[PDB]
Amino acid sequence: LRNRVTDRYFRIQEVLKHARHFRGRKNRCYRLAVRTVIRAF
Amino acid sequence: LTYFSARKGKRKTVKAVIDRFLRLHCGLWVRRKAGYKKKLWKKTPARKKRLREFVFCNKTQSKLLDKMTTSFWKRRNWYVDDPYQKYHDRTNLKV
Amino acid sequence: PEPVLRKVELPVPTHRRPVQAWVESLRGFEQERVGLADLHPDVFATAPRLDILHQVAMWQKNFKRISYAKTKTRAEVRGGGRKPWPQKGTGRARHGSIRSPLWRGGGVAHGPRGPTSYYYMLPMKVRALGLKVALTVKLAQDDLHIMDSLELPTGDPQYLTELAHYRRWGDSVLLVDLTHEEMPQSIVEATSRLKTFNLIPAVGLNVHSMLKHQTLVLTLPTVAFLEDKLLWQDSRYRPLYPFSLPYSDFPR
Amino acid sequence: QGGGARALDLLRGLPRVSLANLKPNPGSKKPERRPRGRRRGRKCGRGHKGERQRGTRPRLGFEGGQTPFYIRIPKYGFNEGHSFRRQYKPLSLNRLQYLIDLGRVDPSQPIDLTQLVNGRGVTIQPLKRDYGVQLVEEGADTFTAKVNIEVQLASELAIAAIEKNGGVVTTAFYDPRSLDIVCKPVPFFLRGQPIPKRMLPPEELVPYYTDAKNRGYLADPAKFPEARLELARKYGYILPDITKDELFKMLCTRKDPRQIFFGLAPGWVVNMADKKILKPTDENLLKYYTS
Amino acid sequence: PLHKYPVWLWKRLQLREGICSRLPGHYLRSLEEERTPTPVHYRPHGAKFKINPKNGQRERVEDVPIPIYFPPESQRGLWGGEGWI
Amino acid sequence: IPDPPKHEHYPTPSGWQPPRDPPPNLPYFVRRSRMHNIPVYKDITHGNRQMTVIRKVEGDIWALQKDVEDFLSPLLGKTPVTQVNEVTGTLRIKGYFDQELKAWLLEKGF
Amino acid sequence: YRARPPPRRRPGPRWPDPEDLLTPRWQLGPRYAAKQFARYGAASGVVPGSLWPSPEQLRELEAEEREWYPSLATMQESLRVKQLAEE
Amino acid sequence: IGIRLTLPPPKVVDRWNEKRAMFGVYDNIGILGNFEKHPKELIRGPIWLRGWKGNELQRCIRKRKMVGSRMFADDLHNLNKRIRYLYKHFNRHGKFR
RNA sequence: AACCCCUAUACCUUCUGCAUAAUGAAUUAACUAGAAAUAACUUUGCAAGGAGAGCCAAAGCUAAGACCCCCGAAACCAGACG
Ligand SMILES: [K+]
Ligand SMILES: [K+]
Ligand SMILES: [K+]
Ligand SMILES: [K+]
Ligand SMILES: [K+]
Ligand SMILES: [K+]
Ligand SMILES: [K+]
Ligand SMILES: [K+]
Ligand SMILES: [Mg+2]
Ligand SMILES: [Mg+2]
Ligand SMILES: [Mg+2]
Ligand SMILES: [Mg+2]
Ligand SMILES: [Mg+2]
Ligand SMILES: [Mg+2]
Ligand SMILES: [Mg+2]
Ligand SMILES: [Mg+2]
Ligand SMILES: [Mg+2]
Ligand SMILES: [Mg+2]
Ligand SMILES: [Mg+2]
Ligand SMILES: [Mg+2]
Ligand SMILES: [Mg+2]
Ligand SMILES: [Mg+2]
Ligand SMILES: [Mg+2]
């Protein structure tokens, strides 16, 4: 049985929704946003 | 240690252990003293008597020897006129 | 006209009394209450052990499972012998084989390595106890009906379906006859054409089927059969060799 | 009665038991641990560098190069010849009396290994160098049963207990093949082999089984009366005259030294399927099985 | 997949098909037989059981032949069963 | 397993005694093992936790727990620590009391 | 539906084909025939006379016993000699 | 990207097909059938796995022993190599000793 | 009231200690790394016995649950090809 993540889209949106009002690529690129969102929190 | 043999997929005994230690069924291991046959001419009677004693191993060593031997060596045996028969079972041991 | 009054053959413990169930028939729509049968309390009134039902149900599902899933390790993927580029000097990450699990098209690091067996056996006594629990649960929840025989007036499946509806036997019914060879032809024809009404011999009874089917129907000969086999487990010695070999008092 | 009857009438008012509402008993399904997430990921419980994290620590028993404990101890023959040492499962008089009181062993007939095994009184393992049962004295004070028992070894006090009550005790040798057959006869009969002869004791055991003090099966019957009287004198009881007992014939029943089973001779083939016995008539075969 | 027959049996199967099938029965029997050669380069035990000195117990003994290499030139002579070791 | 033979006098030389007939009139019953013995078993864990188990208990196991607590309280000097398992019909007791419980259960007639 | 006939132990002796290459060699020997007779008796069809050792087999059996199993008199005599030497 | 834009076709499962309806029947063939047959004899599959369980190393050893002589050349080579790799892993590597 | 005001020395790895001018990383998507015995523990079964021949047993025994990663050298050897 091969299992693959099917709802990764929603997992990404949990972080990016908090980064929409950021400047630059860190408002859309998860790798960048997640670090800045943590710092924001 | 060989945890899974190539022919049977079973644990193996370290036979070096079998040649040196006696396992009492209660879990204790008995051994001789290192050097008990070495340079007796330079050793005192009291020291030589200590070296002749059959002594017990500690917890850590007992755990190690148990791992290095398969279940066969831990079964209860009923050898006829076994010199160690009395020592296989503990008495009045608390905790 | 005379009531069919069945009594428990095997000795019942003195501190316990038999439980009872109506004896019914399938010969007519209203042919309920044809008799009254006593049932051994240690088979049909044991402690309701739902945890043991889980054990036996899970054993049944898995003991005969063999998984055929298999993947290739980095050693079994085609090619991949040579080092793709020198260790140093290229500015690239160091690699030893194009079939490494890091590579597209490479081997699988910790994939399935079938065929894989799941065989295991619960103690015989535990599997026997599970059957006792399943029978008691069916009786305790009014899902057990005892029949004198499985003979129907006709072989039409609609009759049996209508009979269950009128008698409020739920959506699915498990029908247990004593022996495969001696099953009445009428019930054989009706059940063969149905999906939720399934006919099995007594030797085929099992917990999974009993739980899947809402209603359980047993013939009176089947009841005697089951009590004998299941209670034998309670009073038997530890075996000296497999019970298939000759014993003084076994079989029967 | 708040248990059985309360647990079943309470089930009447609950939903039907089905495959959708089953669960394991609490405590029987310990959770599985996976190296995923902050707590269990990162270094995943393996530590940092070294052989530890990389999985290459040395073999069990290795001490880092110091001459290990299990090697620096001198060799000594504690276990030398262990696999050739004869073993005897002990059977106490307490256990024997217990089995008789519960009807598991019948004292009205001769008691041998077969009856002891069939009563689940003792478990014999011929593959583990068990040579039979040794009758031990434990329980002699309270042993009351009168028995004719055949064992492989018997203590002097155990013998006295048997014979104070009017019973008979004999010590009988079984070779490894014979012991397997006598313990589990039915598996042997399914092999379709002629009943073999019981081998004689090894030379080192011949003195034991030819001595009346041990009630050896190869000892001179004329010497038993004196041996039986000595124990009666030593332990302060009067030797009963078993010749006057109603069970005297049964008490005297003994196997021939070459016979595995009572009433069955070497070289007989048991046909269990047809419930018959096949006896060879060839003179050469009869000489082999009778010698 | 697996083969229906073990590979070591393949040669014997070939003898049951084709022209080999039609060979004389007496000849095919001579091919199948594989008697043990007489011991030349090793000394046979001479018994089936021996007493082991170390433990003093009766042990079964077996004669394991020494592999012998017969050079092709041996087939034009008469070496008496001797070959290269 | 054969049923135990009839004996003129009880207890037998080994000490075995059959269950009283009729059964005692108590809220609970304790069934004998298949070997016809009282189901009281010593148990140990961790090399130090000595425990006693009464098995095959039917009826009101809580009534048995109270009776056991009263019976053992004088011997211990305090209330015994116990665990009641209604599902399995088992009472678990801290400490070794097998001999005392066996005789005590036999006197009740189980 | 109706369940299939229960799986039963197919009765009767099973005699494999001796000329089949895939027949296990252990199912073709005399030891296999003896087990069939013990299990099924006369229905086996095994000549009961083939159960005892043949004349040649009986000669080998008697030779091994003579070599490795001495008589009581021999063992007793050997014991006496050993005891005298020790004394 | 990476997520489908339409619903997949609905999953139709016939819970009362003959296979599901008769699942488990004869699992007590021995207990209810005088022990003439063991339930393990109902297991169907590879000849080296019927009524037996083991870890991957044990399975590999068992298969080579029972059917190695019938395996294809390439398959047997991989099997021998797998046995060697697993022998080294289980006997020499790991956290515990 | 977007900014202006105030507060705030990216992250991972590696270390006695890193904003460090120590390591890796343009970004997105997908893929990519903890495998099992010895004992012990927990929860059932039966219990001086347990186990569906073997084994264990001075409360044991049977069954189950639950712990042991990934990538990388320079090399060594065999058989081919130049
Ligand atoms: K030794
Ligand atoms: K962590
Ligand atoms: K931490
Ligand atoms: K390892
Ligand atoms: K890094
Ligand atoms: K710096
Ligand atoms: K720095
Ligand atoms: K640098
Ligand atoms: Mg490769
Ligand atoms: Mg290379
Ligand atoms: Mg490499
Ligand atoms: Mg691939
Ligand atoms: Mg990280
Ligand atoms: Mg690191
Ligand atoms: Mg370090
Ligand atoms: Mg315990
Ligand atoms: Mg530094
Ligand atoms: Mg700083
Ligand atoms: Mg930096
Ligand atoms: Mg650096
Ligand atoms: Mg693991
Ligand atoms: Mg080298
Ligand atoms: Mg080379």
Chain B interface, best mutation among D69, D71, D84, D209, by max B CB count within 10 A: D69
Considering only CB atoms, C117 lies closest to which of H25, H52, H78, namely H52
How near does any CA of chain E get to the CA of D192, in Å?
A: 26
Which nt has its C1' nearest the CA of H2? I29
What's phi and psi for G40, nearest 5 deg? -115, -10
- From chain A residues 2-41, the ones with a CB under 8 A of any chain H CB are 6-9
Angle between helices C220-235 and C124-140 (to 10 degrees): 140
DSSP characters for C71-115?
---TTTSS---S-SS-SSSSSSPP-S-TTSTTSTT---SS--BSS
Number of domains in chain C: 1
Contact C61, C28 (CB under 8 A): no
Q: Give the range of the structural domain holding residue D280, as residue numbers without chain letter.
A: 84-291
Most G-contacting residue of H22, H42, H66 (CB-CB within 10 A), to test interface: H22
- CA H37 → C1' I52, Å? 10
D262, burial (CB in 10 Å: exposed 0-12, middle 13-18, buried 19+): middle
Cα–Cα nearest to D178, from D164, D194, D198: D198
Best CA proximity match to D259, nearest among D173, D193, D188, D176: D173
Distance CA C24, CA C35 (A): 7
DSSP D28: S
Domain housing C82: 2-251
Q: How far is C140 from chain D (nearest CA, A)?
A: 6
CB contact under 8 A, E4 and H70: yes
With beta carbons less than 8 A apart as the criterion, state whether C40 and C231 touch: yes
| CA-based R_g, chain F, Å | 15
Q: Which CATH number does the domain housing residue C186 bear?
A: 3.40.1370.10
β-strand pairing of F40-45 with F49-54: antiparallel
Q: Of C31, C27, C112, C22, give the one whose Cα is nearest residue C66.
A: C112
The verdict on a CB contact (< 8 Å) between D87 and B16 is: no
Per-residue DSSP letters for A1-41? -----S-HHHHHHHHHTTSTTSSGGGGT-HHHHHHHHHHH-
**Cα(C30)–Cα(C153) distance, rounded to whole angstroms?**
13
**Residue whose tokens read 């339930």:** H39
Query: Is D225 inside a domain boundary?
Result: yes
Instruction: Give the CA distances from residue A17 to residues A5, A20, A32, A33, in Å, rounded to whole numbers and listed in that order.
Output: 20, 6, 13, 10
What whole-number distance in Å separates Cα of residue H51 and Cα of residue C65? 10
CA-CA-CA-CA dihedral for C191, C192, C196, C202, to nearest 10: 70
Instruction: Write the single-letter amino acid at D149.
Output: I
Amino acid letter, E4: K
Strands C19-24 and D130-136: unpaired
Strand C116-117 to F82-85 pairing: unpaired
Check: CB of residue D121 under 8 Å from CB of residue D104.
yes
Domain covering G1-87: architecture: Helix non-globular (6.10)
Q: How was this structure determined?
A: cryo-EM
- Strands C197-201, C173-177: pairing is parallel
Q: Would you put residue H44 in left (φ > 0), alpha (ψ -120 to 50) or beta?
A: beta
CA dihedral over C7, C9, C15, C19, signed as positive or negative: negative
What residues does each domain of chain H span?
1-96
Domain count, chain D: 1
What domains can be seen in chain F, in order of their start residue?
A: 1-110 (3.30.780.10)
Residues of D with CB under 8 A from a CB of H: 45-46, 52, 55-60
Q: Which run of H or E residues covers position C66?
A: strand C66-67
Q: How far is the CA of D47 from the centre of ligand 7 (A)?
A: 24
Rounded to whole angstroms, how far apart are CA atoms C49 and D8?
11
Data resolution in angstroms:
2.2
Report yes or no on D58 lying in a domain.
Answer: no
Across all strands, nucleotide nearest C49 (CA–C1'): I44
